[PDB]
Amino acid sequence: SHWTSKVHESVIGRNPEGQLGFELKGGAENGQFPYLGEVKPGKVAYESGSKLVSEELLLEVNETPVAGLTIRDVLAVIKHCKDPLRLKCVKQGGIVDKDLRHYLNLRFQKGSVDHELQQIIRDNLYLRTVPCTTRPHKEGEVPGVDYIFITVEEFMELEKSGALLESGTYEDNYYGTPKPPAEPAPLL
């Protein structure tokens, strides 16, 4: 019944080349969970615990939640984690799907394990996104940092084209979060 009911921990090591044995797909820049490519038996160096089916959603790496991040950021987390890599995953099927917009529209009971996870995933998504809003700019706000200030017509165009991962309304205005960009601007 719960979204988290099939969650499990799989512990792996990196291959001689330094790879995981499978590819990572998805990520928030594509509106998705990070999820595994095809998992071919024999390619993953498992240590001990449960194994992985193809295309499981990746939720945490060595206790750092990565669901809600871009693929770049997920891979950066893995780069700084030391073997063994404890991966929290859940297989796709039923109510569990890689689509982040569908997932963020699910309403879980407050305080439930499903709810706590959803809010962690939202915090990750908020790390690399600026919300858009149709309400006017206010004193002290930096356009493009606090908000993207757009018209209602623009907002609805973003909704219709699937660019928004979540949206809502409050005091006569629309609020929403678009997908983060695939590659961020270099910092150094």
């Binding site: 908020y126 790390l127 606090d146 949206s167 809502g168 409050y170 929403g176």
Partner: peptide
């Protein structure tokens, strides 16, 4: 960045 109170109320 961190969402404001109005945002959180909107997407609850």
């Amino acid at each position: 960045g961190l969402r404001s109170t109005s945002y959180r109320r909107a997407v609850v």
